[PDB]
Amino acid sequence: MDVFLMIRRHKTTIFTDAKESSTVFELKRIVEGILKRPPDEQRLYKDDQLLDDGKTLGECGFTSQTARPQAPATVGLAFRADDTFEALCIEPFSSPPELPDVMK
Amino acid sequence: MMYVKLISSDGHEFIVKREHALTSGTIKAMLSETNEVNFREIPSHVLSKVCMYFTYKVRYTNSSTEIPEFPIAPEIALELLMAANFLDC
Amino acid sequence: VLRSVNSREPSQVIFCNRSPRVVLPVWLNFDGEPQPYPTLPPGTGRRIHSYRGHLWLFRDAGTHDGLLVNQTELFVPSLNVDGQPIFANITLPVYTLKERCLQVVRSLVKPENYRRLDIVRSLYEDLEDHPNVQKDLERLT
Numbered sequence: 185m186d187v188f189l190m191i192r193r194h195k196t197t198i199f200t201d202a203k204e205s206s207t208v209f210e211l212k213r214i215v216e217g218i219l220k221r222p223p224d225e226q227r228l229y230k231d232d233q234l235l236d237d238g239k240t241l242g243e244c245g246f247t248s249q250t251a252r253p254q255a256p257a258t259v260g261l262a263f264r265a266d267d268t269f270e271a272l273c274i275e276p277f278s279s280p281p282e283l284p285d286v287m288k
Numbered sequence: 289m290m291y292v293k294l295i296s297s298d299g300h301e302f303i304v305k306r307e308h309a310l311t312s313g314t315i316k317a318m319l320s321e322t323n324e325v326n327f328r329e330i331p332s333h334v335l336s337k338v339c340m341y342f343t344y345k346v347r348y349t350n351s352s353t354e355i356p357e358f359p360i361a362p363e364i365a366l367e368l369l370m371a372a373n374f375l376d377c
Numbered sequence: 378v379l380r381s382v383n384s385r386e387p388s389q390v391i392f393c394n395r396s397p398r399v400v401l402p403v404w405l406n407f408d409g410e411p412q413p414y415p416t417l418p419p420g421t422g423r424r425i426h427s428y429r430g431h432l433w434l435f436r437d438a439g440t441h442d443g444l445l446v447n448q449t450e451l452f453v454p455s456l457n458v459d460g461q462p463i464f465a466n467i468t469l470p471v472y473t474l475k476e477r478c479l480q481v482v483r484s485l486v487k488p489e490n491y492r493r494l495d496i497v498r499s500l501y502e503d504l505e506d507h508p509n510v511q512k513d514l515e516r517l518t
């Protein structure tokens with residue numbers, strides 16, 4: 185069962201897929217391969233909840249029917265900048281304009 | 289795998305698999321020699337939907353399995369169309 | 378050119394809507410004219426009586442958007458083997474992003490106000506060209 189995810193840190197957004205049986209650590213290995221920073225310097229989050237590396241994505245709520253290809257689930261990323269880890273910050277996308285009158 | 293970066297007009301950088309992005313010949317030509325492509329006229333709330341469409345197309349092309357609708361919120365429907373019209377997606 | 382063969386040979390078919398759209402079944406008569414049939418709500422299946430050699434295409438009932446039957450545009454009932462009816466599986470095609478956006482905007486904008494939108498005139502012309510079975514049949518031929 186494939187799950188589709190957005191790993192988001194600041195204005196960086198990674199679109200990727202994994203298995204529901206895959207662990208958070210494998211997701212971190214993918215993030216390492218992309219952004220070149222080791223898993224021990226990474227911290228992953230579902231909402232405001234820290235994710236343990238040993239748990240599978242399904243246990244942490246990432247199921248194939250909530251993490252859809254046409255509607256992927258959001259996974260927050262936080263990096264260790266120095267001795268301390270940074271706070272979880274995900275910059276929101278731009279806001280759409282007001283709906284035109286002809287569509288309203 | 290191989291990843292490329294697509295930057296919106298408002299600075300959001302989306303990292304997507306190369307194979308998923310190469311479905312569009314527009315992105316394929318825009319790459320050629322580069323793994324980074326900047327879209328100065330496409331905002332993030334539209335380009336994110338574009339990447340979602342990339343994933344959706346790669347997953348559901350050639351499926352007997354019931355294909356779900358691709359959702360488009362009204363508030364972005366216009367701009368996405370323009371983006372699509374400019375990229376032939 | 379595209380027309381049904383008057384075989385007079387029966388073939389029982391299962392119209393299976395595996396799409397989230399209200400499906401209109403269109404049979405092509407012996408003269409090549411599209412004929413509308415009763416609609417199917419989303420996720421529903423009907424057992425019909427049709428004939429071998431007959432031509433069927435499937436549309437969105439409200440918008441006339443093209444739909445796929447058994448992963449192709451046209452369905453022709455065949456011989457029933459061991460009393461088993463023939464499945465016609467109506468699914469959503471993988472639309473281009475432009476066609477999906479056009480569908481959404483058409484569903485949101487009255488045809489009167491297409492020109493009032495702030496888009497390129499090319500796109501007005503594209504909006505007005507909303508799905509039509511006859512033009513699709515002509516191009517096919």
Ligand SMILES: Cc1ncsc1-c1cc2c(cc1F)[C@@H](NC(=O)[C@@H]1C[C@@H](O)CN1C(=O)[C@@H](NC(=O)C1(F)CC1)C(C)(C)C)CCC2
Nearest residue numbers: 383384385386402404414415416417423425426427428431
């Ligand atoms: C319930 C329903 N929900 C979605 S659709 C549907 C449906 C319902 C019905 C038919 C077809 C349908 F989809 C009906 N079935 C047909 O009308 C079939 C379809 C096509 O094969 C043509 N046809 C015929 O009977 C034609 N007859 C012949 O060709 C000959 F008998 C000389 C050989 C016709 C010229 C009388 C129209 C039967 C009555 C009800």
